[PDB]
Structure formats: C-alpha cells, structure tokens
C-alpha cells in the first residue's frame, strides 16, 4: 500500500482519502417525446409553420433512426430464463454493440405497451401525461396558454407567426441534445437528499428505444442508478512538488489520482465520476494498472520513482503537509522563526521538510504562517529513472543511443579482424 | 489490400466498407448581415439603446476587421485568363494565407455590386431582401411586429426597454458565432433530398468578405458543395479485441479507420466528415500514410502487427463476426451448445474463432445466441513488435537499453586491453 511518509521526501504528496460508490444496477423508466404539438382543429391555424418545423425535425430524427436501426440489426427460446436471445447477424459487432443490442431485446416487452399509449397521445392536448410511462408534447403548454388565446384575440394570421418562433426555438434546443445523450439535457428542456446523488443521476446516459418517423416521436429509456459503496476502496489525489538535483528542478510525474482495493494499487480515471465532499460516485470502476516503476515508487521504494524536468510554473515549489511545510528551498526562500533567518538546504537534498519541532513561524517568499502544534508531520536518495515526456526528446536521445551502438559494432569488426 | 480473414486471427476485425464523396468544387453565394435595425424616424425611440448595442458590436466586428485586413495585406494583368494576380507584399504568408488572399481577389468583382445594394439596405425596413445577394437586418422582424406597435400602445419610454432586451439577446448569439465560422451557426440565427447532404452543407466554413465599421455590416461568401463520388475508394472501420499471450491481454493498436484507393492503403481521419448510412462525405481526402509495420500487418503479414498491453475495459474481449464469434476465451467464458460446456482455448492461442460448424448455440458470459447458418466465417503466430503507447514507458525502456549499452562498451575496453 501507499507509503505516504517516505513519498514526501521526493515531493510526492498523497492526500484526501475518499471512498467510492458505483452504480452497479439501474432501474429503468420510459419517456416518450412527442415533438409535434396539437393546435385546435377548429381553426387550422399554424399548419404551414408545423410543416416547416417537420422539415427541420427530419435533420435530427432520421440520423437517430439510422443509429437505432444499426443497433437492432446486430441480433436477428426467448421469454424463458436461460433461453437463447437470438441469431447472430451477418456483420461485425463489438461487445459494446452486443450489449446495446441485448438491451433493446429486453425493452421489446415495453414497446408493445408504449405503442398503445401513442394512440392516446396523438389527439390529446396535454403537455405532460402518464399512463409508469411519461409522455411530453414539445411546445404544448405554450400553445395552450399563448397561441390558442391569440387566435380569438388577434386572428389566425398574426398568431401563426408566434408559433413559428416558438417551434424554431425548440428546434435549436433539440439540436444541442440530439445533434451519448445524458438525462441532464432532457431534463433541461422539459423542466434521498444528497445533491451529489442527484447530480450523478443526470450524468447517466439515456437509451433510445424507438424513433417514429410517422408521428415524430422518440422513445427513451431513463436509467436510475442504485449506488453501492465499495468496501476497502480508497481514492487519493496526489500532487508532486519540485525536487532539487544539482540546482535543477525535477519532479515525479505521477498520475493525478491513485486507488487502493486491498493489496491492489493503481490509478483512477475519475473524469466521469462526481466528486462529493467525502466520496466519488462513478458509473464503473475507474482503476487502471500503473507502470511497474510507478507502483513500486508509491509502495515506498522511492529510488524507483521516475523523474522529469520542470518546464513551467504549474508545478508547485512548496506545500503545506501535516501542519508543516515541504518545499524546494533552493528556488523558494524558506525562512525560519522570522523573515531574516533563511533555511538553507544543501545541494544534494531534494526537498526540505519543516516541522513544528524546528520552526514556530515559517515564511514562504515572505508569507508568514504559524506551524501547527498538533501536526503529525515527521538519507541519500538517487533517482536513476530519468524520463522525458515529449516524443521529440525521446527521439533525440534514441538517436544518440543508435549512434553509440553503431560505434560499438565497429569495434567488434576491427577486433574480430585482429582475433 | 486488406486481408480481412487473416486479421481475425490477431483479433483485428475490419468491417463496414463505405464509399466516399468529396466536395471538389463549390458554388458561391453572398450574404450581407446588417447588424443595426431601423426604428421609425417619426418617433426617435430606441436611439440610446442602439448606441449601447453599437458599443457592444465593436467588441466583435473590430477583431473581424483586423483579421480580414490581415488577409487582404498578403497581395498588394489581372482580369485576363492566365494573368498576374498581384504583387507579393513584404511579410510572410503560408499557403493557407495565400489561398485566403486569392479568394478575396476573386470576390473583388462582387464587392462593387454589394456596395450599391448597401445604399438601399440602409433606409429599408425589410428583414430579408434580395437584389442573387441576400441581405438580413438583425432584429428587424421583431422591431416591425413588436416595438413599432408598442410605441402607440404604450409610449416611447416603455418600449425602449423592450428593444434593449432584444438587442442584448442578439448580441449573445452573435458572440457565439463570431467571438472558422460554419454556415450552421448563421442559419441558426436567421432561421436534393438526402439529409446527409444538407448536414454537410452546413458543415462548410463561410468566408468573410467585408466588415464595414461605419454601417456595422458583415459580408459573407457562402459555399455550396458539389459532391462527387470517388471511384475505387472504400473506408473501413477496424476494431481490435483482446489477444491472449501467456495469460496476459494484448491488442493491436490500429487506427480507427483505414482507407483503400486501388493499391494504396492508409488511414482515414474522418473527424471532419459526415457519416451517412452508406458513404462518408468529406471536405477533402482524409487519408494519411501508415507506419510500414501497420500497412504490412493490414496487408496480411500478421507477424508484423504491433501489439500493446490492455490497460482498461475499453478494449472489447469478444465480437460477433460473420455469423459466429471471435473472442478471447481465457478471460471470457465462451460456451458451446449449452451453458455447461466451456470452450477452452490453449494458452498459446490468442483468440478463439467459433463458427456454426462447431457450435449451434454460443454463449458469451451466459448470453446465449444462435449461430447463423448463412455465416461466411471461416498456425503459430509470433508477434515480436511489442510497442508502448506511453512516453514514460518508452523512456523507462530506453534507459535500460542505454544502461546495457554502457556495459557493452566496457567489455570492449577490457577486451581491447588484453588484445
């Protein structure tokens, strides 16, 4: 496991142990988006505006149809536990596509009920309706409370132009979502107490189940996470400060987050997770396997830590650690017990660890801070694993090796001659 | 050309041959955006709001002017076929800048007509006008149908506040576009039967031709693609599944798309293309030259295929291929003719290819599927080209080589001493 104390001596600071919650299961609910609003048949107003709006919808529902059809074509008995799902189609489908296809076979039993509700949704003037399966008609609330009043108040031709503007606004917001798809977008259009669980729920991708090109309807499966806290799992953030080697600034280029699961130690790719104050909520395990030298470094064999040169000011030169300061006092003006007493670190030491046992007040570049009395902050280190991050640099040093290798081969040829 | 059958044996699955259409020519049309709306001179309402709106416009039209001026300064007889275009200016201009500059010399003959229409657009209250060259006045439809009615209905001071809000909304949507520029954005502001040809047209970049800082106008050249289907051109998607080497998971890191043009075989960077159901529509040829080992691998010399370690679950472990399954049955529980009969692949085999001649029902991790009877799915392989994707890993292994190289040189020195 992580040896946090030794890693400080190479400027590697491991902090903020947070737990992890994974959405190992999902509860599914269905949403029917009915994109054409209903205008009262008594007046026939807005027909031309709906015709133009329909022409815009084709530019996003037809691409959705093509994608869903491609998923349905992966699989050409069923309805029995442990039965066969279907026949493999002629083509190629990766595991991601097979899972998507299998999910649609599971949703098939719902589609036969949704196809009944669609007949009721057609003639209905309601904006939101539930039969559970929820159905929404795009602009229908605005039509009921703005356009239908207008047709009496202002006459048919003036009110049609008001509908056209509303429909074109709705098309612009539809394009942002459908032009995977997260619940956050759908919830934005149509408007447990942990805020972070709510935020994570909107992060989950919705699954398209049907795209009806006749009635301009999209059926979506909404997935609600069931969150389970994994035991013996800790995610740490790690920061590296500059490390002095003969008056040149180096640092250990470790990944931004690391993870432990008992004896396993690896990185964490939390880019898809929601970071709460005390835990990460992730759709799946973010762990990945580290380079052998990085894993060995983190396990406390700090001689193995890879090091690279500091190219910019993004790398911090100092940090607070456990009530004291860990800093590169060559490039940072470390000061002890008053702004005049500079702490000098010898050229062969990489970072200075300053504790309350040595300084009551520590000044970093003039900033005076008191050390913490309850702080728990506590040899020759040679870091041979010099590393370059930039492909040009690696290529340049590879050319030097090849040049030296050709020279080595020549000595063999001449030496073989005298032999 | 691609040897799809052999590549399956290294877990490389080549699928979905799609054609390619390129926009080799463009038809140009001109659009004048007149950013200041006209308020009826009888009342002088809105003058103060327009002044504030003008001050906001400077923050985006002055940067456009500076960029356009920079393009016009590349070139300081003409009007004859095969004549000189102009004199090279004192400066530096890359081939991209020369093309932009030459395009402006071609548009010169249009500017002398656009400068006549600008005089009519000034006093006119029309929102869209054509003289073809199209001209649009920013908020003019709203001004005609909302603000001018208001000034009688509610008086001058109340209606000014309504204009100010409208202008600020238009500024926000102008900033998203102008703060290259695609026609999709312009079409969003101002509201053949193949949908994918329409989507590609909106993908094309508009060209700014003039920025008038006196009348607050932008002139744009809209380019309409002429699409031509290239013969003997096929674009394939390729997916790599995990490959077993002594109970460790490897894969071939091939590019996401590959392309053939007769004998030429290379990659395709379709990131700018529109993927239709049967072809890709691209602004220019997406092909790029592959590494010699990747081209040889794809040509069926599968011993040459580069291989890298599986670091995450993104790499699929199994796929459907031509009516059967290609999978790494070490880490995947492959099952034949019933969930109890596990398929065992030997440790020296990378992937298992399961066909209808061997299994009627194939189970992947419990998921039972029937094999396809009309499926067309059909030696020691040593993959020596081990490859690392991460610069740290390359640097670490380069240090080991250099360390071994210094040791080799020492043996030469002592051997030369005894000789």
């Amino acid at each position: 496991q992580i040896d946090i104390t030794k890693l400080q001596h190479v400027g590697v600071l491991v902090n903020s142990p947070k737990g992890m919650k994974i959405s190992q299961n999902f509860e599914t609910r269905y949403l029917i988006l009915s994109l054409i609003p209903k205008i009262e048949d008594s007046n026939s107003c807005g027909d031309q505006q709906i015709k133009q709006y329909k022409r815009l919808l084709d530019r996003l529902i037809i691409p959705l149809y093509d994608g869903l059809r491609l998923q349905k074509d992966v699989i050409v008995t069923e309805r029995f536990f442990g039965g066969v799902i279907g026949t493999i189609a002629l083509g190629v489908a990766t595991s991601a596509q097979i899972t998507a296809a299998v999910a649609l076979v599971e949703a098939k039993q719902a589609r036969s009920d949704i196809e009944k509700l669609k007949e009721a949704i057609r003639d209905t003037n309601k904006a939101v309706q539930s039969v559970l399966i929820v159905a929404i008609k795009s602009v229908q609330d605005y039509v009921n409370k703005e356009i239908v009043p207008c047709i009496a108040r202002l006459g048919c031709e003036a009110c049609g132009l008001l509908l056209g503007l509303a429909l074109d606004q709705h098309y612009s917001e539809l394009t942002n979502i459908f032009g995977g798809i997260k619940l956050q977008g759908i919830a934005s259009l149509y408007r447990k107490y942990d805020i972070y669980d709510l935020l994570f729920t909107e992060s989950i991708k919705v699954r398209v189940i049907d795209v009806d090109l006749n009635d301009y309807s999209i059926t979506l499966q909404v997935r609600l996470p069931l969150l389970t806290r994994l035991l013996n799992t800790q995610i740490y953030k790690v920061d590296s400060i500059s490390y002095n080697i003969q008056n040149r600034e180096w640092y250990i280029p470790l990944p931004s987050h690391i993870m432990t699961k008992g004896a396993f130690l690896g990185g964490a790719d939390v880019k898809e997770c929601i970071e709460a104050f005390s835990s990460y909520i992730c759709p799946s395990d973010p762990g990945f396997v580290l380079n052998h030298e990085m894993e060995s470094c983190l396990s406390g064999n700090i001689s193995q830590c890879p090091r690279t040169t500091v190219t910019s000011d993004i790398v911090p030169r100092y940090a607070f650690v456990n009530g004291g300061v860990v800093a590169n006092c060559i490039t940072t003006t470390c000061t002890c017990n008053g702004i005049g007493n500079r702490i000098n670190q010898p050229p062969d030491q990489g970072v200075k660890i300053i504790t309350h046992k040595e300084c009551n007040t520590i000044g970093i570049n003039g900033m005076l801070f008191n050390t913490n009395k309850e702080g728990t902050l506590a040899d020759d280190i040679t870091l041979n694993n010099s590393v370059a991050l930039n492909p040009i640099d690696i290529s340049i040093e590879l050319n030097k090796a090849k040049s030296d290798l050709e020279e080595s081969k020549e000595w063999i040829r001449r030496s073989n001659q005298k032999l | 050309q691609i040897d799809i059958t052999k590549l399956q044996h290294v877990g490389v699955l080549v699928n979905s041959p799609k054609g390619m259409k390129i926009s080799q020519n463009f038809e140009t049309r001109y659009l004048i955006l007149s950013l200041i709306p006209k308020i009826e001179d009888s009342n002088s309402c809105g003058d103060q709001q327009i002044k504030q709106y003008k001050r906001l416009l400077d923050r985006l039209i002055i940067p456009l002017y500076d960029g356009l001026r920079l393009q016009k300064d590349v070139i300081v007889t003409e009007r004859f076929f095969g004549g000189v275009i102009g004199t090279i200016a004192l400066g530096v201009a890359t081939s991209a800048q020369i093309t932009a500059a030459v395009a402006l010399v071609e548009a010169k003959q249009a500017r002398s007509d656009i400068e006549k229409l600008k005089e009519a657009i000034r006093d006119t209250n029309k929102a869209v006008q054509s003289v073809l060259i199209v001209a649009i006045k920013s908020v003019q439809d709203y001004v005609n149908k909302e603000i001018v009615p208001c000034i009688a209905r509610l008086g001058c001071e109340a209606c000014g506040l309504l204009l100010g809000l409208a202008l600020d909304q238009h500024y926000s949507e102008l900033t998203n576009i102008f703060g290259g520029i695609k026609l999709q954005g312009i079409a969003s502001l101002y509201r053949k039967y193949d949908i994918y040809d329409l989507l590609f047209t909106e993908s094309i970049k508009v060209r700014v031709i003039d920025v008038d800082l006196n009348d607050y106008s932008i002139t744009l050249q809209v380019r309409l693609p002429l699409l031509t289907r290239l013969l003997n051109t096929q674009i394939y998607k390729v997916d790599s599944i995990s490959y077993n080497i002594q109970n460790r998971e490897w894969y071939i890191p091939l590019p996401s798309h590959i392309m053939t043009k007769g004998a030429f075989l290379g990659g395709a960077d379709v990131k700018e293309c529109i993927e239709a159901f049967s072809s890709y529509i691209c602004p220019s040829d997406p092909g790029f030259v592959l590494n010699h080992e990747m081209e040889s691998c794809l040509s069926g010399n599968i011993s040459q295929c580069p291989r890298t370690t599986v670091t995450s679950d993104i790499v699929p472990r199994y796929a459907f291929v031509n009516g059967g399954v290609v999978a790494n049955c070490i880490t995947t529980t492959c099952t034949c003719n019933g969930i109890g009969n596990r398929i065992n692949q030997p440790p020296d085999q990378g992937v298992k290819i399961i066909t209808h001649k061997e299994c009627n029902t194939i189970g992947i991790n419990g998921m039972l599927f029937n094999t396809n009877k009309e499926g067309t799915l059909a030696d020691d392989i040593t993959l020596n080209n081990s490859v690392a994707l991460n610069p740290i890993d390359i640097s670490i292994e380069l240090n080991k080589a250099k360390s071994d190289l210094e040791e080799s040189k020492e043996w030469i020195r002592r051997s030369n001493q005894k000789l």
Epitope: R55, I62, Y65, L70, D73, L213 | S278
Partner: nanobody, 124 residues
C-alpha cells in the same frame, strides 16, 4: 451498390391502365427492414408520395389523392415492386420513381436510394 431500375412507362389514353415495375439489387442494402415505394414529380414541383409497401409484412399505403386508383404489390423472390395504375387521368402525368427507404416512406426525405424514373404521359 443498390440499384433500382424502373420500366413500363409510356404514353397512355385517359381511362386506360398501366403497370410499372421496379427491379432492385437489395443484397447490398445495409438493413433487412425497409419499405419500398413510388413517387412522382411534375417538372416544377416536389416529389409527391404515390404508394409504399412494407417489404416484410406486405402492408400497402397510399395518399388520399389516389386511394383505390393505384395498387402496389411486391414479389420478394423476384426482388420486384409493382404499381398498377387504373382509371388514369390527365393529372397523373409525371416522372415516376421507385425508392427503397425508411418506414413509412411517406415522404422523399426517407428514401435510401432512388431509381432513374420513368415518364408516364396521360393524354385525352
């Protein structure tokens, strides 16, 4: 490569009958679920829907302008689609196109591929 080839168009007397045929090389098509249908175009107008058929179910669909006049049929073994036109009228003169496309093929935006069209001229 999906190719559609129409045949059977020509000049015809009003009240007469004509039978169009379309041969389809659907083996290259990326899906097995699709409609086939017929469209007509006057030289100054957009392509009107005329008929569509579900290739698997055989359900036929028509616009109200032609209901009961024209009938669409298919033969899956021939890869052929047919449109028999009866009680022809002068307004029926148009180029007729067969298409393979997305359900319901009620509008030309839904087609995957288009035939070359056949001229039908109806004369008094």
């Amino acid at each position: 490569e999906v190719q559609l080839v129409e045949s059977g168009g020509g000049l015809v007397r009003a009240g007469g009958s004509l039978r169009l045929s379309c041969a389809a090389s659907l083996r290259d098509l990326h899906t097995r679920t699709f409609y086939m249908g017929w469209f007509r175009q006057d030289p100054g107008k957009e392509r009107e829907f005329v008929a569509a058929i579900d290739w698997n179910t055989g359900a036929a669909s028509y616009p109200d302008s032609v209901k009961g006049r024209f009938t669409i049929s298919k033969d899956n073994a021939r890869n052929a689609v047919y449109l028999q036109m009866n009680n022809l009228k002068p307004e029926d003169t148009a180029v007729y196109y067969c298409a393979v496309g997305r359900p319901p093929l009620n509008r030309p935006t839904l087609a995957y591929y288009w035939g070359q069209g056949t001229q039908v001229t109806v004369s008094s």
